[PDB]
Amino acid sequence: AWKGEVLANNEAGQVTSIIYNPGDVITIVAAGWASYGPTQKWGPQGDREHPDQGLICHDAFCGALVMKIGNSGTIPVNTGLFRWVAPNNVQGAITLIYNDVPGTYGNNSGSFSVNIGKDQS
Amino acid sequence: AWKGEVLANNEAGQVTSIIYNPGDVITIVAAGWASYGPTQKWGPQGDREHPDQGLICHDAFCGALVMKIGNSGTIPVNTGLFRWVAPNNVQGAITLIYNDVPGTYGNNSGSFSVNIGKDQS
Amino acid sequence: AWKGEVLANNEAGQVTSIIYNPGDVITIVAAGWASYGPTQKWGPQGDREHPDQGLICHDAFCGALVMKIGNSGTIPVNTGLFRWVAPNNVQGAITLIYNDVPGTYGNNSGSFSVNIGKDQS
Amino acid sequence: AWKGEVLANNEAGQVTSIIYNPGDVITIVAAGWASYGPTQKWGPQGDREHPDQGLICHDAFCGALVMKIGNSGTIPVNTGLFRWVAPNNVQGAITLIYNDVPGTYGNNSGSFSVNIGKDQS
Ligand SMILES: O=C(CCCc1ccccc1)NO
Ligand SMILES: O=C(CCCc1ccccc1)NO
Ligand SMILES: [Ca+2]
Ligand SMILES: [Ca+2]
Ligand SMILES: [Ca+2]
Ligand SMILES: [Ca+2]
């Protein structure tokens, strides 16, 4: 029920129309190519070779797709989530974000194409 | 309803328990790191810079995840398929395969973790 | 998903654990046999021949299954709802209720078995 | 996936476009009013008070909704089936049928409105 693009250079991330409510089961699929600065591109799992120098999400590689649900901290998405249920006390609008160091989004390029849907529960 | 791994060095691929029937809607999500020979690894979209020297799937990069449905030709999966329906006359077990040149799977390493489910239809 | 029973004699109805949120798609199936007083029994559509003498739901027959979502007005359920979205902006817990005139639940008998699930959206 | 009507007077029943395949989960909801001969009408559970005089389905009341899957024996549907899986070795097109005595469908009237969908598995 949501399809769109998340730009690697967008520090604020892309607000979706999906409101995660308690008990919701969701599926995410992410595709595409992006860079956090170097003259190469990576998919939605990012670059396993790059050290973490203050990423917004310590549980995903630099250049990975991550998300926030309302005011949650960052949650790894990577290539996507299969029939996934959030931790207790997590709810609200899903924001998709490119995993980088705050203040370093200006040299980023490319984007991921993302589908999000609610599953049966 | 199927969860598993597909080994990059398995030329025959991983035959799943999912039988695709006409009208079925499926979702696939793939994650992980694999190599077609080099010391680097790539995610399930593969290596966008490697030329095609006789890949089993010409519509996906070397080192991408692809599939067959029964005895179909290869179909790109990459990071996954969101609520996907097959063409007419495509039916049978889903086989997941690492995209490489026939005869060259021996120097491959790593695997993709894959979830497949049938959706509402 | 929720499975349970609503008694025809319960003016307060049965509060379920299903929270209807905006955009939710739900499926309900209701079965069983109940009476609003007469010696006969009706299924969850109720008695199409009995006049409305002040039913809690004017859009369903006497002895039908109806519901509230949070503090909404009554909504007909009857035998159930197939991949149903609320026509109004309503939200909150689903309460199931037997459709009868307030203060006349004392001569009611029987019950409906009800399954509620959220569908893909 | 399928929405339509089954006439009470149709002895052959109504063939749907739903092919039940092994492993499939289905949901059916049925509504409406029909008769096996009397002036009164009943919902999809039929008439609890009418004796079985050789019904096509001995496990449902006269005037109930029943079905066959391919050439299976009759299976009770009544008001519907919630996330239901068939017994082993039952496969093929779903035919919906009004439960009556063979040869006695000529005096029947009305119809049930029926929705069938495949659920997640
Ligand atoms: O923008 C940054 C810091 C520098 C990234 C970079 C490293 C090597 C070559 C070019 C750029 N992090 O996201
Ligand atoms: O209880 C009522 C009013 C009376 C309905 C009734 C009619 C004939 C025989 C017994 C009861 N409304 O639900
Ligand atoms: Ca950067
Ligand atoms: Ca190789
Ligand atoms: Ca009453
Ligand atoms: Ca008859």
XYZ file of C-alpha atoms and ligand atoms in Angstrom:
514
model
C 0.000 0.000 0.000
C 2.979 2.503 -0.167
C 5.471 2.652 -3.099
C 8.127 5.399 -3.394
C 11.795 6.405 -3.421
C 14.187 7.339 -0.600
C 17.100 9.631 -1.632
C 20.508 8.807 -0.119
C 21.237 12.579 0.326
C 18.009 13.201 2.383
C 19.126 13.482 6.052
C 15.465 13.819 7.280
C 14.391 10.659 5.372
C 11.167 10.036 3.409
C 7.895 10.067 5.425
C 5.566 7.313 4.120
C 1.737 7.182 4.437
C 2.059 3.895 6.431
C 1.068 4.279 10.102
C 2.427 1.298 12.035
C -0.184 0.399 14.736
C 0.289 -2.118 17.595
C -0.097 -5.736 16.351
C 0.521 -4.734 12.649
C 2.473 -7.217 10.466
C 4.353 -5.479 7.611
C 6.381 -6.451 4.578
C 9.007 -4.147 3.028
C 10.994 -4.773 -0.194
C 13.769 -2.279 -1.147
C 15.809 -2.153 -4.388
C 18.326 0.155 -6.101
C 21.802 1.661 -5.885
C 23.231 4.487 -3.729
C 26.473 5.952 -2.349
C 27.424 7.608 0.964
C 30.274 9.448 -0.890
C 32.746 7.087 -2.630
C 32.803 6.541 -6.420
C 30.992 3.153 -6.089
C 27.349 2.192 -5.381
C 25.801 -0.294 -2.945
C 22.374 -1.904 -2.582
C 20.049 -1.478 0.401
C 22.330 -3.499 2.790
C 25.044 -0.823 2.254
C 28.861 -1.288 2.403
C 30.133 -3.982 4.857
C 33.744 -2.618 4.394
C 33.089 0.925 5.737
C 33.628 1.495 9.485
C 30.829 3.035 11.639
C 31.981 6.631 12.518
C 28.614 7.652 14.142
C 25.894 6.159 11.874
C 22.233 6.961 12.773
C 21.797 3.122 12.978
C 24.661 1.123 14.602
C 22.868 -2.201 13.708
C 23.177 -1.663 9.894
C 26.089 -0.914 7.515
C 26.862 2.548 6.176
C 24.579 3.076 3.094
C 21.881 0.635 4.323
C 18.128 1.419 4.330
C 16.821 2.018 7.895
C 13.567 3.374 9.302
C 11.927 5.072 12.233
C 8.375 4.287 13.373
C 6.914 7.487 14.883
C 9.563 8.620 17.450
C 11.336 5.191 17.680
C 15.111 5.006 17.240
C 16.418 3.663 13.904
C 15.470 0.079 12.921
C 17.375 -1.755 10.117
C 15.344 -2.475 6.918
C 18.178 -3.423 4.483
C 16.645 -5.305 1.487
C 13.348 -5.581 3.411
C 11.359 -7.188 6.196
C 9.144 -10.269 5.823
C 5.879 -10.379 7.841
C 7.572 -8.340 10.561
C 6.146 -7.161 13.911
C 7.697 -4.189 15.762
C 8.890 -4.291 19.388
C 6.217 -3.391 22.030
C 5.672 0.400 22.526
C 6.664 1.254 18.853
C 3.948 2.953 16.692
C 3.299 5.836 14.229
C 4.318 6.936 10.688
C 7.165 4.975 9.015
C 10.054 7.229 7.910
C 12.622 5.593 5.603
C 16.229 6.888 5.927
C 19.610 6.224 4.298
C 22.106 5.099 6.997
C 24.935 7.687 7.180
C 26.724 9.928 9.739
C 24.711 13.069 10.619
C 26.139 16.073 8.720
C 27.679 13.857 5.966
C 24.567 13.423 3.706
C 25.666 16.188 1.259
C 28.092 13.925 -0.727
C 25.492 11.070 -1.015
C 23.831 10.030 -4.318
C 21.266 7.581 -5.766
C 18.101 6.255 -4.135
C 16.197 3.079 -3.176
C 12.760 2.096 -4.550
C 10.654 0.781 -1.612
C 7.299 -1.092 -1.285
C 5.569 -1.314 2.148
C 2.353 -3.235 2.829
C 0.410 -4.493 5.824
C -0.045 -8.294 5.963
C -2.858 -10.409 7.452
C -2.958 -10.761 11.283
C 5.826 -20.314 4.468
C 9.381 -21.148 3.152
C 12.543 -19.782 4.861
C 16.084 -20.871 3.978
C 19.393 -20.082 2.326
C 20.528 -20.370 -1.293
C 24.255 -21.208 -1.661
C 26.154 -19.240 -4.332
C 28.215 -22.397 -5.186
C 25.074 -24.583 -5.861
C 24.526 -24.636 -9.696
C 21.216 -26.622 -9.319
C 19.923 -23.960 -6.839
C 17.598 -24.520 -3.837
C 14.236 -26.233 -4.630
C 11.684 -24.775 -2.184
C 8.370 -26.232 -0.903
C 6.423 -23.306 -2.494
C 4.296 -24.567 -5.427
C 3.324 -21.543 -7.550
C -0.217 -22.102 -8.924
C -2.036 -19.908 -11.480
C -3.441 -16.726 -9.841
C -1.091 -17.017 -6.794
C 0.376 -13.762 -5.376
C 3.812 -14.193 -3.725
C 6.235 -12.106 -1.745
C 9.991 -12.862 -1.613
C 12.562 -11.002 0.515
C 16.276 -11.839 0.060
C 19.262 -10.674 2.140
C 22.937 -11.648 2.535
C 26.358 -11.601 0.884
C 27.789 -13.841 -1.868
C 30.571 -13.973 -4.468
C 30.852 -15.408 -8.015
C 34.666 -15.728 -7.414
C 36.277 -12.380 -6.382
C 37.198 -11.738 -2.666
C 34.467 -8.972 -2.489
C 30.849 -9.990 -1.778
C 27.633 -8.478 -3.224
C 24.006 -8.480 -2.089
C 21.133 -10.136 -3.957
C 21.123 -7.562 -6.834
C 24.672 -8.820 -7.650
C 27.552 -6.865 -9.217
C 26.222 -4.172 -11.635
C 29.795 -3.722 -13.073
C 30.544 -7.376 -14.086
C 29.891 -8.168 -17.778
C 27.483 -11.040 -18.715
C 29.633 -13.950 -20.140
C 26.675 -16.440 -20.414
C 24.678 -15.960 -17.139
C 21.677 -18.305 -16.534
C 19.585 -15.071 -16.301
C 20.470 -12.300 -18.826
C 17.873 -9.937 -17.137
C 19.813 -9.772 -13.803
C 23.436 -8.928 -12.862
C 26.055 -11.611 -12.162
C 25.640 -12.662 -8.495
C 21.924 -11.701 -8.328
C 19.205 -13.966 -6.925
C 16.952 -15.449 -9.653
C 14.316 -18.196 -9.724
C 12.528 -20.779 -11.806
C 8.896 -21.789 -11.395
C 8.668 -25.488 -12.343
C 10.574 -25.699 -15.694
C 10.163 -21.939 -16.555
C 13.115 -19.876 -17.771
C 14.929 -17.833 -15.098
C 13.054 -14.870 -13.533
C 14.929 -12.095 -11.654
C 14.248 -11.879 -7.877
C 17.117 -9.558 -6.761
C 16.234 -8.190 -3.244
C 12.681 -9.595 -3.620
C 9.249 -9.460 -5.223
C 6.322 -7.605 -3.607
C 2.863 -9.150 -4.175
C 3.991 -10.604 -7.508
C 1.891 -12.611 -10.045
C 3.460 -14.793 -12.825
C 2.502 -14.844 -16.562
C 0.030 -17.456 -18.029
C 1.360 -21.058 -18.265
C 3.945 -20.648 -15.391
C 3.346 -23.220 -12.575
C 5.236 -25.532 -10.179
C 7.917 -25.523 -7.444
C 9.972 -22.333 -6.972
C 13.732 -23.016 -7.342
C 16.020 -20.215 -6.131
C 19.378 -19.882 -7.951
C 22.506 -17.737 -7.733
C 23.024 -16.017 -11.138
C 26.374 -17.178 -12.624
C 27.807 -18.784 -15.823
C 27.101 -22.542 -16.076
C 30.269 -24.502 -15.145
C 31.705 -21.604 -13.045
C 29.885 -22.142 -9.673
C 32.889 -23.940 -8.075
C 34.726 -20.709 -7.080
C 31.523 -19.087 -5.602
C 31.003 -18.475 -1.851
C 28.401 -17.185 0.625
C 24.615 -17.441 0.472
C 21.372 -15.411 0.430
C 18.778 -15.809 3.208
C 15.318 -15.905 1.549
C 11.693 -15.825 2.790
C 8.823 -16.747 0.406
C 5.123 -16.578 1.228
C 1.811 -16.679 -0.603
C -0.236 -13.472 -0.153
C -4.000 -12.877 -0.204
C -5.601 -13.063 -3.683
C -7.251 -12.544 14.752
C -10.057 -12.925 17.358
C -12.482 -15.862 17.898
C -15.318 -15.802 20.437
C -19.064 -15.665 21.098
C -21.662 -12.903 21.630
C -24.786 -13.760 23.733
C -28.171 -12.554 22.405
C -29.078 -11.690 26.069
C -26.121 -9.242 26.516
C -27.273 -5.617 26.005
C -23.588 -4.489 26.595
C -22.276 -6.829 23.816
C -18.808 -8.489 23.670
C -15.674 -6.260 23.513
C -13.055 -7.939 21.260
C -9.229 -7.477 21.227
C -9.429 -6.199 17.592
C -8.581 -2.452 17.391
C -9.859 -1.074 14.074
C -7.353 1.589 12.877
C -7.739 3.927 9.869
C -7.095 2.085 6.561
C -7.583 -1.391 8.158
C -9.162 -4.114 5.974
C -11.029 -6.728 8.064
C -12.920 -9.951 7.507
C -15.646 -11.184 9.888
C -17.545 -14.499 9.698
C -20.477 -15.030 12.113
C -22.492 -18.237 12.665
C -25.075 -19.647 15.068
C -28.702 -19.373 16.189
C -30.436 -16.815 18.428
C -33.855 -15.441 19.365
C -35.019 -11.931 20.345
C -38.018 -13.571 22.159
C -40.148 -15.820 19.928
C -39.840 -19.662 20.107
C -38.043 -19.757 16.666
C -34.312 -19.083 16.046
C -32.605 -16.926 13.367
C -29.033 -16.717 12.096
C -26.861 -13.600 12.170
C -28.968 -11.728 9.529
C -31.877 -11.843 12.050
C -35.606 -11.894 11.153
C -36.415 -9.957 7.913
C -40.192 -10.033 8.779
C -40.088 -8.392 12.272
C -40.731 -4.611 12.422
C -38.074 -2.225 13.881
C -39.571 -0.981 17.243
C -36.420 0.961 18.356
C -33.481 -1.377 17.475
C -29.935 -0.244 18.419
C -29.175 -0.585 14.634
C -31.873 0.686 12.201
C -29.815 -0.633 9.190
C -30.171 -4.340 10.205
C -33.069 -6.677 11.089
C -34.067 -7.520 14.665
C -31.795 -10.391 15.836
C -28.933 -9.496 13.432
C -25.262 -9.258 14.533
C -24.065 -5.628 14.617
C -20.940 -3.906 15.899
C -19.451 -0.687 17.165
C -15.898 0.501 16.487
C -14.796 2.498 19.555
C -17.755 4.901 20.215
C -19.166 4.725 16.621
C -22.869 4.174 15.950
C -23.897 0.573 15.241
C -22.690 -1.018 11.971
C -24.410 -4.100 10.472
C -22.239 -7.283 10.403
C -24.913 -9.925 9.652
C -23.185 -13.161 8.428
C -19.915 -11.159 8.150
C -17.854 -8.648 6.208
C -15.448 -9.582 3.382
C -12.233 -7.482 3.123
C -14.164 -4.523 4.503
C -12.955 -0.948 5.041
C -14.987 1.460 7.200
C -16.932 3.992 5.011
C -16.458 6.583 7.859
C -13.304 7.724 9.798
C -13.954 5.394 12.806
C -11.307 3.944 15.149
C -11.040 1.743 18.272
C -11.994 -1.650 19.753
C -14.687 -3.686 17.925
C -17.692 -4.487 20.184
C -20.105 -7.126 18.853
C -23.806 -6.767 19.829
C -27.117 -8.574 19.228
C -29.553 -6.175 17.474
C -32.561 -5.698 19.775
C -34.609 -2.906 21.429
C -32.968 -1.591 24.639
C -34.702 -3.092 27.727
C -36.051 -6.111 25.759
C -32.906 -8.367 25.986
C -34.401 -10.454 28.892
C -36.385 -12.841 26.624
C -33.372 -13.344 24.234
C -31.516 -16.674 23.935
C -28.691 -18.272 21.942
C -25.444 -16.750 20.699
C -23.307 -16.168 17.605
C -19.752 -17.499 17.113
C -17.590 -14.828 15.405
C -14.102 -14.830 13.780
C -12.412 -11.455 13.059
C -9.101 -11.011 11.224
C -7.182 -8.137 9.629
C -6.444 -8.642 5.901
C -3.595 -7.379 3.701
C -3.730 -3.642 2.888
C -10.944 -13.236 -5.639
C -14.554 -14.354 -6.563
C -17.909 -12.574 -5.908
C -21.243 -13.884 -7.241
C -24.644 -15.458 -6.515
C -25.809 -19.070 -6.129
C -29.500 -19.691 -7.015
C -31.400 -22.030 -4.680
C -33.144 -23.654 -7.701
C -29.834 -24.492 -9.528
C -29.373 -28.253 -8.914
C -25.910 -28.266 -10.659
C -24.712 -25.366 -8.420
C -22.576 -22.369 -9.448
C -18.995 -23.094 -10.639
C -16.631 -20.358 -9.352
C -13.253 -19.330 -10.862
C -11.526 -20.318 -7.557
C -9.303 -23.414 -7.985
C -8.537 -24.836 -4.516
C -4.913 -26.116 -4.608
C -3.129 -28.178 -1.923
C -2.034 -25.968 1.019
C -4.489 -23.146 0.095
C -6.159 -21.161 2.910
C -9.568 -19.693 1.925
C -12.187 -17.399 3.418
C -15.847 -17.483 2.328
C -18.637 -15.116 3.446
C -22.247 -15.854 2.333
C -25.354 -13.673 2.796
C -28.956 -13.554 1.534
C -32.332 -15.308 1.667
C -33.531 -18.516 -0.026
C -36.228 -21.237 0.194
C -36.358 -24.990 -0.560
C -40.140 -24.626 -1.266
C -42.075 -22.882 1.571
C -43.072 -19.132 1.374
C -40.595 -18.358 4.264
C -36.896 -17.752 3.458
C -33.769 -18.747 5.461
C -30.168 -17.524 5.517
C -27.144 -19.585 4.458
C -27.308 -21.940 7.508
C -30.742 -23.082 6.182
C -33.737 -24.345 8.220
C -32.704 -26.051 11.537
C -36.292 -27.488 11.915
C -36.723 -29.248 8.511
C -35.880 -32.984 8.524
C -33.138 -34.415 6.217
C -35.080 -36.388 3.501
C -31.969 -37.251 1.370
C -30.024 -33.934 1.239
C -26.893 -33.713 -1.000
C -25.043 -32.778 2.267
C -26.036 -34.687 5.469
C -23.669 -32.427 7.542
C -25.735 -29.216 6.887
C -29.417 -28.211 7.255
C -31.854 -28.151 4.335
C -31.389 -24.758 2.581
C -27.761 -24.274 3.756
C -24.894 -23.233 1.442
C -22.563 -26.182 0.699
C -19.729 -26.668 -1.790
C -17.698 -29.195 -3.708
C -13.988 -28.828 -4.451
C -13.401 -30.519 -7.841
C -15.471 -33.754 -7.520
C -15.151 -33.946 -3.666
C -18.129 -34.899 -1.491
C -20.270 -31.936 -0.340
C -18.639 -29.689 2.310
C -20.762 -27.396 4.526
C -20.156 -23.621 4.045
C -23.187 -22.112 5.867
C -22.431 -18.378 6.580
C -18.778 -18.952 5.529
C -15.378 -20.371 6.422
C -12.614 -18.403 8.142
C -9.007 -19.100 7.026
C -9.958 -22.679 6.193
C -7.787 -25.554 4.858
C -9.356 -28.595 3.100
C -8.867 -32.291 4.038
C -5.969 -34.092 2.220
C -6.388 -34.989 -1.504
C -9.154 -32.355 -2.127
C -8.309 -30.076 -5.101
C -10.009 -28.284 -8.040
C -12.705 -25.701 -8.863
C -15.060 -24.683 -6.012
C -18.745 -25.249 -6.935
C -21.301 -23.631 -4.597
C -24.622 -25.500 -4.149
C -27.905 -25.003 -2.266
C -28.482 -27.991 0.074
C -31.663 -29.813 -1.043
C -32.926 -33.313 -2.026
C -31.958 -34.238 -5.623
C -34.970 -33.826 -7.955
C -36.663 -31.268 -5.590
C -34.846 -28.019 -6.683
C -37.741 -26.933 -9.001
C -39.796 -25.303 -6.183
C -36.735 -23.449 -4.693
C -36.308 -19.637 -4.796
C -33.914 -16.837 -3.822
C -30.108 -16.872 -3.824
C -27.012 -16.370 -1.643
C -24.415 -13.670 -2.407
C -20.957 -15.233 -1.819
C -17.378 -13.861 -1.626
C -14.370 -16.228 -1.806
C -10.727 -15.207 -1.357
C -7.392 -16.944 -0.844
C -5.589 -15.998 2.397
C -1.878 -15.861 3.286
C 0.096 -19.085 3.817
O 30.359 11.424 3.648
C 30.915 10.664 4.464
C 32.359 10.818 4.867
C 33.288 10.557 3.678
C 32.852 9.410 2.737
C 33.875 9.156 1.649
C 34.939 8.267 1.851
C 35.906 8.068 0.861
C 35.810 8.749 -0.353
C 34.763 9.639 -0.564
C 33.815 9.852 0.441
N 30.319 9.623 4.991
O 29.052 9.291 4.557
O -38.441 -8.777 23.167
C -38.816 -8.010 22.277
C -40.272 -7.609 22.145
C -41.174 -8.844 22.099
C -40.883 -9.835 20.966
C -41.686 -11.121 21.016
C -42.719 -11.359 20.117
C -43.424 -12.560 20.133
C -43.140 -13.518 21.087
C -42.160 -13.266 22.027
C -41.436 -12.086 21.985
N -38.010 -7.574 21.344
O -36.829 -8.253 21.079
Ca 28.060 10.759 3.094
Ca 31.985 -18.247 -10.327
Ca -36.032 -9.331 23.000
Ca -37.140 -27.985 -2.892
